[PDB]
């Protein structure tokens, strides 16, 4: 029953084209609402809501504080980018792919073909489906990217189809951790 | 290339609990354990390639608590409105019998960052092999969290994720079984 | 490699 009070501070570094263009943001929040913000383009603090005007006027009066935040694209952003570069921006983990039908049932009945892609990093991945060698872009549904919270993603790309005898459905996965595409086939059978 | 590194911090009253963590493209690099005053890396291998001085994090958490007391008064003690969480339970791999798997309980879109997550195996609380994450930040400035239960897929075993939050009138129970 | 810490600007008073 005791009322709570939350302060949040988020020092954000945004990188484009590696470190060729960097933007720094010094964001101060009260109850999930941004009150005052320093941005490496404006060069000083600004108040997003009126309730953070006193802090912006105060920090903008001190050149020592401003020269500290103006420098943070170089002494903080590009610095911490280089510290973790080898195991973050260059991290490559390949996924395990598994293809399985959603229902054990006869052919010529409607079915849903699941291509499960588990454990890749980074998130950039392309997943395709092939019916007898022809890519099929209709009837595809994806869960999107699922973060497992451990520096791996997963995703399920499902295919709606009516399976027929002799059909070979192929899931194809493309990912930076792999020099060649990953393919897993499913036999329709009888 | 396009990435986002975020150094995210918070302080909560009157709970007097703080958190300091780094975030890369949505993933936690490390957090500072306020109790032990030590850097805790999300993946143990990370500490072999980099280090971090926990006392600089503690400096900021002292600043944030003074910053919060000023802002609470400035707002005439405007409290935070609780937000209940969304709970989704899943596995990190397709389920096969006698093939080891991990249950993931995903708590999302909530605030303030205080929860009670309890794994249950057939109604029985399980406290062996469980692990969890700290509160991870969101771009809408809510929080998220992961809890993990490694298990052996069975036909007679049943699991539940029990999440208690102030935004909930009743403890939220999300279910899982071998037949999803 | 040592990670840096961006400081939080102190509120007046």
């Amino acid at each position, epitope marked *: 029953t005791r009322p709570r009070f939350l302060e949040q501070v988020k020092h954000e570094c945004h990188f484009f084209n590696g470190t060729e263009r960097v933007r720094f943001l010094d964001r101060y929040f009260y109850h999930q609402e941004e009150y005052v913000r320093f941005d490496s383009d404006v060069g000083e603090y600004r108040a997003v809501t009126e309730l953070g005007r006193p802090d912006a006027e105060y920090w903008n009066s001190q050149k020592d504080l401003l020269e500290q935040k103006r420098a943070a694209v170089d002494t903080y952003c590009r610095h911490n980018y280089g510290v973790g570069e080898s195991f973050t921006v260059q991290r490559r983990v390949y996924p395990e792919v598994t293809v399985y039908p959603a229902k054990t049932q006869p052919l010529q009945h409607h079915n849903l073909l699941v291509c499960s892609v588990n454990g890749f990093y980074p998130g950039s991945i392309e997943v395709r489906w092939f019916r007898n060698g022809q890519e099929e872009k209709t009837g595809v549904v994806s869960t999107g990217l699922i973060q497992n919270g451990d520096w791996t993603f997963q995703t399920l790309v499902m295919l709606e189809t009516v399976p027929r005898s002799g059909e070979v459905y192929t899931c194809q996965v493309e990912h930076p951790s792999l020099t060649s595409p990953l393919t897993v086939e499913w036999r329709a059978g009888s | 290339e396009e990435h986002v590194i975020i150094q995210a911090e918070f302080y909560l009253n009157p709970d007097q609990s703080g958190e300091f963590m780094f975030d890369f493209d949505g993933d936690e690099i490390f957090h500072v354990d306020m109790a032990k005053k030590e850097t805790v890396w999300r993946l143990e291998e990370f500490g072999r390639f980099a280090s971090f001085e926990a006392q600089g994090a503690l400096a900021n958490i002292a600043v944030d608590k*003074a910053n919060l007391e000023i802002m609470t008064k400035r707002s005439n003690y405007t409290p935070i409105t609780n937000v209940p969480p969304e709970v989704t339970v899943l596995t990190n791999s397709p389920v096969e019998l006698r093939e080891p798997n991990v249950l993931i309980c995903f708590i999302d879109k909530f605030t303030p960052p205080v929860v009670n997550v309890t794994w249950l195996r057939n109604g029985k609380p399980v406290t062996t092999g469980v692990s969890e994450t700290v509160f991870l930040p969101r771009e809408d400035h809510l929080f998220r969290k992961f809890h993990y239960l490694p298990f052996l897929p069975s036909t007679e075993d049943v699991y539940d994720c029990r999440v208690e939050h102030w935004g909930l009138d009743e403890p939220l129970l999300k279910h899982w079984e071998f037949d999803t | 490699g040592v990670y840096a810490t961006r*400081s939080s600007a102190v509120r007046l008073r």
Partner: T-cell receptor
Amino acid sequence: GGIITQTPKFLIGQEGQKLTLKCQQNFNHDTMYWYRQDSGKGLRLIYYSITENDLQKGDLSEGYDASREKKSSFSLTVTSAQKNEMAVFLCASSLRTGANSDYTFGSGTRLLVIE
Amino acid sequence: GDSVTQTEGQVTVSESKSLIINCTYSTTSIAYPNLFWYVRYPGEGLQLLLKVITAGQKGSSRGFEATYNKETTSFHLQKASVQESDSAVYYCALGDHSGSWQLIFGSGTQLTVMP
């Protein structure tokens, strides 16, 4: 017109005596410091106090005790001048902005202990 | 080891002649250092003279200049033509960009410029 003054400028003491040094500043600086410049070399921090709570660091183990009730006054005492030491004590203060604010120093107190 | 070392003792130069006061630094816990020069004129306290917070940048004040050099891990103080009013003690100090680490001062180099 800012000033930071420590008293006394010169202070001779005997062994085991409890010698108190006082420093006050009118800069509205939240944090104050107490350094010890010894005959040889090196400034060495004995005590610093960010706002209203000190933090022993650097040179307490030599036997000191600080106190600070007002934002403007930082008091240093030598628990037991032992013995025949010769040292300058410098008082500093700085603004707590979160940035590296410039230190403002005092002239110094010359302490001399004799038998 | 998180420290600073500079020229030991005293340096004597002639008026209107070049001066160079070496300084270097080491680091273990400070992630991104900031570098400072402090001056103490005779019968006064230390005050800030120069200050550089960014890799490879040069700071200049009162005819002096120092370059934060990360390749040589130095911050040497230089001046083309010293005046008689520059006779003082110069200190090299080391902090962190966060502002959370107390300044690490050097031993101090004493400069006396003869007329």
